C-alpha cells in the first residue's frame, strides 16, 4: 500500500503540504492579478507590474518545490481549484503592497502551523525543509513589503500622485 | 470613464478574452499536474516530467500575453477560479500525451471560435494577434503530440516496459 | 494601360493608399511641429523633443512603406498637399501627448477603414500588409501614449512644476 | 476515420493544397529549364542561369513547405505528374523573364483562389499560412521580374547585343 | 514681449526663416516624389530612387536645423502647407536631374536673399549660420547635379535606354 | 545545325543523357515522396524523413550535373514529364528502404547501359564522366541501403514496434 520511499512521513503532514501547494499557487495567482492592474492604461506603472510579475513567478516556484517535496517523501499530490483573488481592482500601488503584505503573512501563518505540525509528529526533515527554503524567505518578503508601504505612506500616496510614480522609478526601477 | 486607448474592440471580444485567459491558465495547471505525476517514485520518468513542466510554463506565458493584449486594447481583466485537472493520476506516459493532445485541441477549438467572433465584429488586430501568436503555435503543438502518441503506440506503450523508458531518453531527452 | 505587375488590386484600394500616404505624411508634420515646441527656450523639454521627433521620423517611415506598397502592386502614386497642423502652440507635454493620442487613434481609424475595403474587394495581401506592419504598431503606440497621459495626469501636469520636468528625465529620458 | 491531429481542415482545402504543391513543383521545373537554357554554349549567360537556378530551388522549398503544412493539419499528400515546360528553347533573356513573370502571376492567382477557399471554409490558420509565407513573396517576385523586364526592354534586348550581356553582369551579377 | 534669449534678431529674418523652412520641406517632398517614381515597375531604376531618397532625407534635416536656429535666436516657428510637387510623372532620369538642379538653384536663390536680408539688418550670426551650413552645401549640390545632367546628356539620355541603366549602376551605385 | 563545341558526341548518347536526366529527376521525386510520408503524424519518424529528403536533393544534384554535361558537349536539353511515384503510401521504414534499394539499382542499370552505349560509340570522356561521378556513387548508395535493409530485418521491423523507432535514432540520427 504505502510508497517504497516513505519513512517517518505522517498522513496529516502529507495533507498539509497539499494545502500549502494550493495556498502557494493561490499566492502566485494573486500576484499575477496585481501585475495586470499596473499594466492597465489608466494605471500605467510598469515597474509595479514587473515587480509583482516577478513575485508571481517565485510563488509558482515555491509551489513546484513543495510538489517535489511531496513526491520526495513518498506522499501523493492531489490538486484543488485555485481560487481567484478577492478583488479585481486593486486601487493603487500602496494598497497592492498592503494586500501583498497581508497575503505573505497569511502564507507565513500556514507555514508556521505546518512547521508546528511537523514538530509534533517528530519530522525533522520536513522541519528543516520549511525552515531553510520558506520561513527565511517569508520573513524577507514581509520586511521588504513593509518597507515599501512605509516609504509610500511617507511620500503621500496615493493622494500625491507624484509619489507612486517616483517610487516606481527609484525603488522598483533600481 | 471608459478606456482612452479603446477602439473597434467589441465588448464580447473583451469577455471572450477573459474566458480564453482562464482556459490557458487551466491548461498550465493541467500540464503542471502531469509533470508531477512522472516525478512520483512509482512512475519516475524524468524527461516526461521535464517535458510537461516546460509545456505548463509556455501555457502560463500564453496566458500572460492575452492579459497584455487585454490592456493594450483598453479592455479590463476579470479572473475566475482555475479549475483542477479532471484526474489526479494520469495512468501512463502514452495516456498523458493523449490527454495533452485532446487538451490542445480544446484550447485550439476555443481560439478558432474566438477568431470567428473577432471576424464577425470586424476586428483585424485581434484576428492577426490570434493568427500570429496562437493558431500557429496550436497546430504545431498538436502535430508534436500526435507524433509522440504515434511513437509510444507503435513501440507498444504502456504494457511493453521499455517503450516509455526508451522514449523518455531518446525523444524527450533531446 | 494597366501595369504588368497588377493583380487583384482594385482602383478604390489604390486611391485609398494615396489618401493614407498623405495622412501618414501629415502625422509626421504634426509630430515635427510638436517636437519643435519643446525645443523652444520658454518650454525647454529636451526629451519631449526627442520623443516626438522620433515619432515624426517613423510616421515618415510608415509613409515611405505605403509608397513602396503602391509601386509593388502596380498602382500609381499621386501626391497631394500636406496640410499644416491646427495649432502652433501646444501648451505643455501633457496636452501634446493627448493630441498625439487622438492623432494615432484617427490614423488607426483610417487604417481600419482601409482594411475593411481590402476585405470587401478580396485582397488578402493588402489585408496582411496592413495587419503585419501597421495595426500592430498603432495599438502599441496608442497604448504607450495612453500610459504617458495617465502618468502625467496623476502627477499633476502641467500646473505642478516638476511634473513634466521629472517625467522628462525618468520616462522619456 | 480522419487524422488524430485534424481540426477545421476541409476536404477541398486538403485537395487544393495537393494541386498547389504540383503547381510549385511545375514552376520549379520551369525555372530549372530556363536556367539550363542560358548555360548552353550558344546562349552562355552565367548569371541568367544562376539566377533562374536560384528561383528553381526556392520553388522546391515552397513545394516542400506546403507538404509540411499538409501533414500538420492532418491532410494527406497525393502527388501528381510534373508537366514538362511548354517550351524548351526560351529564345532570349527578355522572353524568359516575360515567361517567368507570367508564371509567377499564374501561381499567385492560384494562391489567391486557395485563400478565398480557406476564407469560405472559416480556416484562419490556412489563411495566415498563405498570407505570411506566399502572397508577400509572390508580390515581391512579380515586382522583381517586372523591373527586370522593364530594364531589358529599355536596354533594347534582345536586338541590342550588349543589352542582355551587361544586364547579366550588373543587375544579376 | 520678446523671448529671454532674443538679441539682434529682426522679425523679417524670423519670418523669412519660416518661409525658408517651408521651402526646405518642399524641396524634400519633391525629392520623395522623384524617389517614388524610380521605384515604379515601368521605370525600375533602383539607385536613382536610392539617390533621390537620400536627398529627401537631407532636405528634411536642413529644415529641422533651421527650426533649431529659430528657437536658438528667440524666434517662433509658424508652419505652412507643404505644396505638392508640380508634376507626378517625372518622365526620365535626365529630366528628374534637371528638375532637381532647377530646384536646388531656386533654394540657393532663396538663401542668397535670406543672406542679404540678414546682412542688411547687421546680423553676423545669421550670416555665418547660412554661409557655414547652407551656401557651401547648395553650391556643392548644384555642381553635382550639373555633373549628372551633363553625364546623362553626353551618354545619350533618354533615347538610348541603356544610358540611364548604366548611369544607375556606375555613378549612383 | 551542329553546335560549335560538339566533338565526338554521338546523337544516340545525347538522347540517352536526356532520359537519364528524367530518371534522376524521377529518383529525386520518389525520395521526396518517401521523406514526406515519414513526416506524417501517424508515422512520425523524423530522421527517416531527413535521410530521404537528403537523397532527394542529391538526386537533383545528379540531374543538374547531367544537364551541365549535355551543354558542355554541344547537346541540347529536351525535358520530359517527371512521372509520379508508383505509390503514395510507403507502408513503413523497412519498405521505404527496400523500394529505395530497388530504385538505386534501377538507376544503376540505366547508367551501365549509358556507359555501354558510350563505350560502343568510342566516347571516352562520357565513359569517365559516368565512372567518376555516378557509378562509384551508386555502388555506395546501393551498399548503404543494403545495410539499412538488413538491420531493419534483423531488429524485426516493422512488426516489432521499437525496431524502426530505435533505428531512427541510432543509425539515422
Ligand atoms: Fe510562497
Ligand atoms: Fe496555449
Ligand atoms: Fe502611423
Ligand atoms: Fe489575415
Ligand atoms: Fe512560388
Ligand atoms: Fe536645402
Ligand atoms: Fe543518382
Question: How many whole angstroms from A168 Cα to the centroid of ligand 3?
Answer: 30
- The ligand placed nearest to the CA atom of residue A138 is 1
Are E103 and E141 contacting, i.e. CB atoms less than 8 angstroms apart?
Answer: no
DSSP-derived letter for residue B41 is T
Burial profile B131-169: b = 16 or more Cβ within 10 angstroms, e = fewer: beebbbbbbebbbbbbbbbbbbbbbbbeeeeebbbbbbe
Q: Is the dihedral of CA D117, D123, D126, D129 positive or negative?
A: positive
What φ, ψ does residue E82 adopt, rounded to 5°? -85, 105
CB contact at 8 A, B113 and B135: no
Using only C-alpha atoms, what is the Rg of chain A? Answer: 18
Q: Confirm if D129 and B140 have CB atoms less than 8 A apart.
A: no
- Please tell me what DSSP assigns to residue C87: -
Q: Look up residue F162 and give its three cell numbers.
A: 521499437
The verdict on whether residue B59 carries a ligand-binding annotation is yes
Residues 6+ apart with CB under 8 A from D85: D29, D30, D33, F79
Query: Would you call B83 an interface residue with chain F, using a CB distance cutoff of 8 Å?
Result: no
- Partner residue opposite F82 with nearest CB, options D60, D71, D81: D81
C-alpha cell at F69: 554535361
Give the residue from E154, E42, E158, E47 showing the smallest Cα distance to E92. E158
How many C-beta neighbours within 10 Å does residue F61 have?
12
Q: Does C127 touch chain D (CB under 8 A)?
A: yes
Residue E33: which of E104, E106, E83, E108 has the closest Cα?
A: E83
For residue E108, CA distances in Å to E100, E111, E113 come to 12, 5, 9
| Grid cell digits, residue E43 | 521605370
Residue D154, Cβ neighbours under 10 Å: how many?
Answer: 21
CA separation for the pair F132, F147 (Å, rounded): 23
Q: What distance, in Å, lies between the first and last C-alpha atoms of chain B?
A: 52
A138 assigned binding-site residue: yes
Residue-wise over A66-94: b if at least 16 C-beta within 10 A, else e?
bbebbbebbbebebeebbbbeeeebebbb
Residue matched to cell numbers 549612383 = E172
Among E66, E29, E34, which Cα is nearest to E48's?
E34
Q: Which residue has the cell 492560384?
A: D110
How many domains are there within chain D? 1
C-alpha distance from F38 to closest chain D C-alpha (Å): 10
Beta bridge partners of A82: B82
- Where helices occur in B9-135 by DSSP H, the ranges are 11-37, 46-72, 93-120, 124-130
CB crowding C6-41: b at 16 or more within 10 Å, else e: bbbbbeebbebbbebbbbbbbbbbbbbbbbbbbbbe
- Which residue in the block uniquely carries the three cell numbers 492532418? D74
Residue C5 distance to chain A (closest CA, Å): 44
Name the minimum distance, in Å, from the CA of A166 to any CA of chain C: 9
Partners of B82 in beta bridges: A82
Q: How many CA atoms lie within 13 A of C25 on its CB side?
A: 26
The angle that helices F93-120 and F46-72 make with each other, rounded to 10 degrees, is: 10
- Give the span between the Cα atoms of C166 and A162, in whole angstroms: 10
User: What is the Cα Rg of chain B in Å?
Assistant: 18
**Chain A interface includes B117 (CB < 8 A):** no
Q: Report how far residue F162's alpha carbon sits from residue F171's, in angstroms, rounded to the nearest whole number.
A: 14
Nearest by Cα to E32 from E53, E3, E11 = E53
Size of the D and F interface in Cβ pairs below 8 Å: 75
Taking a C-beta distance cutoff of 8 angstroms, is the pair F74, F125 a contact? no
Nearest alpha carbon to residue D35 among D47, D49, D46? D49
d(CA A146, CA C94) in angstroms, rounded, equals 34
If one counts every other C-beta atom within 10 angstroms of the C-beta of residue F140, the result is 10
In the numeric block, which cell numbers belong to residue C120? 470587401
Residues with CB under 5 Å of ion ligand 6 are E 24, 59, 62
Of B146, B155, B156, the CB nearest to F41: B146
CA–centroid distance, A75 to ligand 5, in Å, is 59
- Between the alpha carbon of residue D2 and those of residues D10, D18, D129, the distances in Å are 11, 17, 22
DSSP secondary structure string, A30-81? Answer: HHHHHHHHHTSTTT--HHHHHHHHHHHHHHHHHHHHHHHHHHHTTPPP----
Beta bridge partners of F82: D82
Q: Å from B154 to nearest chain A CA?
A: 30
What's the reported resolution, in angstroms, to a tenth? 2.8
DSSP A27-42: HHHHHHHHHHHHTSTT
Question: How many whole angstroms separate alpha carbon C93 and alpha carbon F124?
Answer: 85
C82: helix, strand or coil: strand
Q: Which of C50, C65, C57 is nearest to C29 (CA)?
A: C57
For residue F74, give the nearest of D41, D67, D84 by CB distance. D41
H-type alpha helices, F9-92: 11-38, 46-72
* Residue F58: closest CA among F32, F88, F83, F40: F32
E164 SS3 class? helix
Q: For residue B45, give the C-alpha cell.
A: 520518468
Q: How far is CA F159 from the centre of its chain?
A: 28
Q: Is the peptide bond before D158 cis (omega within 30 degrees of 0)?
A: yes
CA F4 to chain centre: 32
Distance of alpha carbon E139 from its chain centroid, rounded? 11
Q: How far is the CA of A92 from the centre of ligand 1 (A)?
A: 23
Task: Locate C111 and state its grid cell.
Answer: 487604417
The Cα-based distances of C109 to A89, C135, E9 in angstroms read 30, 10, 44
Across the interface, whether the CB atoms of F161 and B170 are under 8 A apart is answered no
Distance from Cα A164 to the centre of ligand 4, integer Å:
41
Half-sphere exposure (Cβ direction) of D163: Cα atoms closer than 13 Å: 20
CB E49 within 8 A of CB E84: no
Beta-carbon contacts of residue E164 (< 8 Å; ≥ 6 apart): D154, E45, E48, E92, E93, E94, E152, E157, E158
**Is the Cβ of C144 closer than 8 Å to some Cβ of chain E?**
no
- For residue F126, give Cα distances in angstroms to B162, F7, F21: 54, 12, 14
Closest CA to E164 of A135, B107, D153, B173: D153
Euclidean distance between CA atoms C108 and D43, whole angstroms: 53
Q: Which of C72, C124, C129 sits opposite D143 (nearest CB)?
A: C72
In contact, D13 and D59? CB cutoff 8 Å: no
| Chain B partners within 8 Å of C135 (Cβ) | 124-125, 128
At residue E82, the 3 state secondary structure works out as: strand
Min Cα–Cα distance to chain B from A61, Å: 11
Q: How far is D110 from chain E (nearest CA, A)?
A: 22
Closest residue to B41, CB basis, from A3, A42, A67 = A3
Cα separation, E86 vs A108, whole angstroms: 77
User: Which chains lie within 8 Å of chain E at 3 or more CB pairs, if any?
Assistant: C, D
How far is the C-alpha of F43 from the C-alpha of F45, rounded, in Å?
Answer: 6
Cβ atoms < 10 Å from Cβ of F139: 12
Binding residues of F: 24, 59, 62, 104, 138
Q: Give me the domain span that covers residue B173.
A: 1-174
**CA D79 – CA C51 distance, rounded (Å):** 56
Q: Do D67 and F39 make contact, defined as CB atoms within 8 angstroms?
A: yes
Q: Quote the CA–CA distance of E18 and E79 in Å, as a whole number.
A: 7
Q: Where are the alpha helices (DSSP H) in E39-121?
A: 46-73, 93-120
Calpha distance E24→C46 (Å, rounded): 24
Q: For cell 548518347, what's the residue?
A: F13
Contact (Cβ atoms closer than 8 angstroms) between residue C111 and residue C135: yes
Q: How far is the CA of C53 from the centre of ligand 3 (A)?
A: 14
User: B31 to each of A21, A156, B34, B54, E59, how far by Cα in Å?
Assistant: 15, 44, 5, 9, 59
- Cis-peptide into F87, omega within 30 deg: no
Q: Tell me how many residue pairs between chain D and chain E have CB atoms under 8 A apart.
A: 35
Check CB contact under 8 Å for D7 and B109: yes
Contact A78, A30 (CB under 8 A): no
Count how many pairs of residues, chain B against chain C, have C-beta atoms within 8 Å.
37
For residue F140, what are the CA distances in angstroms to E54, F59, F100, F133? 58, 14, 13, 12
Cα maximum dimension of chain D: 63
Count of residues making up chain C = 173
Contacts of F140 (CB under 8 A, 6+ apart): none
Contact (CB, 8 A) for B74 and C139: no
| Interchain CB contact of E162 with D (< 8 Å) | yes
What is the nearest CA distance from C118 to chain E, expressed in angstroms?
22
Query: How far is ligand 6, taken at its centre, from the CA of residue E119, in Å?
Result: 20
Calculate how far, in angstroms, residue A154's C-alpha sits from the geometric centre of ligand 5.
66
Name C71's Cβ contacts closer than 8 Å, sequence gap at least 6.
C77, D143, E36, E39, E40, E41
Neighbours of ion ligand 3 (CB under 5 A): C 62
Q: How far is CA A60 from CA A67, B84, C158, D28, in A?
A: 11, 16, 42, 52
The CB density around residue E143, as the number of other CB atoms within 10 Å, is 11
CA distance C90 to C98: 10
Closest CA to B66 of B112, B7, B15, B121: B15
Considering every ligand atom shown, identify the ligand nearest to the alpha carbon of residue D111 and give its number: 5
Name residues whose C-beta falls within 8 Å of residue C24's C-beta, 6 or more positions apart in sequence: C59, C60, C62, C63, C66, C107
Backbone angles phi, psi at D38, to 5 degrees: -75, -10
Answer whether D39 touches F (CB < 8 Å): yes
Backbone angles phi, psi at C10, to 5 degrees: -75, 150
Q: Among F47, F156, F161, which would you mutate to test the B interface (most chain B Cβ atoms within 10 Å of its Cβ)?
A: F161
Which 3 state secondary structure label does DSSP give C118? Answer: helix
Q: Which residue has the cell 508640380?
A: E86
Please enumerate, by residue number, every residue of F annotated as part of a binding site for Fe cation: 24, 59, 62, 104, 138
Answer whether the bond into residue D84 is a cis peptide, omega within 30°.
Answer: no
Q: Are F148 and F97 in contact (CB under 8 A)?
A: yes
CATH of the domain at A51: 1.20.1260.10
Query: Are A44 and C146 inside 8 Å of each other by CB?
Result: yes
Closest CA to F63 of D33, D49, D27: D33
Cα torsion at B1, B3, B5, B7 (round to 10°)? -110
Rounded Cα distance between E75 and B170, Å, is 74
| Residues whose beta carbons lie less than 5 angstroms from ion ligand 5 | D 62, 107
Q: How far is CA B112 from CA A15, B75, B139, in A?
A: 40, 20, 11
Of B71, B77, B80, the CB nearest to A41: B71
- Which of B150, B163, B166 has its CB closest to that of F44? B150
Pairwise CA distance, residues D56 & A63, whole Å: 55
Nearest Cα residue to D25 out of D68, D80, D74: D80
Residue D77 carries which DSSP code?
-
Which residues, 6+ apart, have CB-to-CB distance to C171 below 8 Å? A169, C148, C151
Report in angstroms the alpha-carbon separations of D85 from A96, B148, C39, D67, F77.
71, 42, 65, 22, 12
Most E-contacting residue of C71, C73, C80, C87 (CB-CB within 10 A), to test interface:
C71
Cβ-defined contact of D112 to C124 (cutoff 8 Å)? yes
Q: How far apart are CA A68 and CA B36, in angstroms?
A: 7
d(CA F89, CA C33): 67
- Give buried/exposed letters for A134-158 (b at 16+ CB in 10 A, else e): beeebeebbeebeebbebbeebebe
List phi, psi (to 5°) of A82. Answer: -90, 115
**Annotated binding-site residue? D98:** no
Lookup: cell for A59:
510563488
CB–CB of E56/C64 below 8 Å?
no
Touching, A vs F (3+ Cβ pairs under 8 A): no
Under DSSP, the state recorded for F92 is S
Amino acid at each position: 500500500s504505502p510508497s517504497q520511499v516513505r519513512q517517518n512521513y505522517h498522513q496529516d503532514a502529507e495533507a498539509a503540504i497539499n494545502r500549502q501547494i494550493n495556498l502557494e499557487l493561490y499566492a502566485s495567482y494573486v500576484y499575477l492579478s496585481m501585475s495586470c492592474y499596473f499594466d492597465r492604461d489608466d494605471v500605467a506603472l510598469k515597474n509595479f507590474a514587473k515587480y509583482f510579475l516577478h513575485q508571481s513567478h517565485e510563488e509558482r516556484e515555491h509551489a513546484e518545490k513543495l510538489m517535489k517535496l511531496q513526491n520526495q517523501r513518498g506522499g501523493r499530490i492531489f490538486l484543488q481549484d485555485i481560487k481567484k483573488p478577492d478583488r479585481d481592482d486593486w486601487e493603487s500601488g500602496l494598497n497592492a503592497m498592503e494586500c501583498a503584505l497581508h497575503l505573505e503573512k497569511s502564507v507565513n501563518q500556514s507555514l508556521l502551523e505546518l512547521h508546528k505540525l511537523a514538530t509534533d509528529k517528530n519530522d525533522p526533515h520536513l522541519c528543516d525543509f520549511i525552515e531553510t527554503y520558506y520561513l527565511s524567505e517569508q520573513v524577507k518578503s514581509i520586511k521588504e513589503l513593509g518597507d515599501h508601504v512605509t516609504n509610500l505612506r511617507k511620500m503621500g500616496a496615493p493622494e500625491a500622485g507624484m509619489a507612486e510614480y517616483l517610487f516606481d522609478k527609484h525603488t522598483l526601477g533600481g
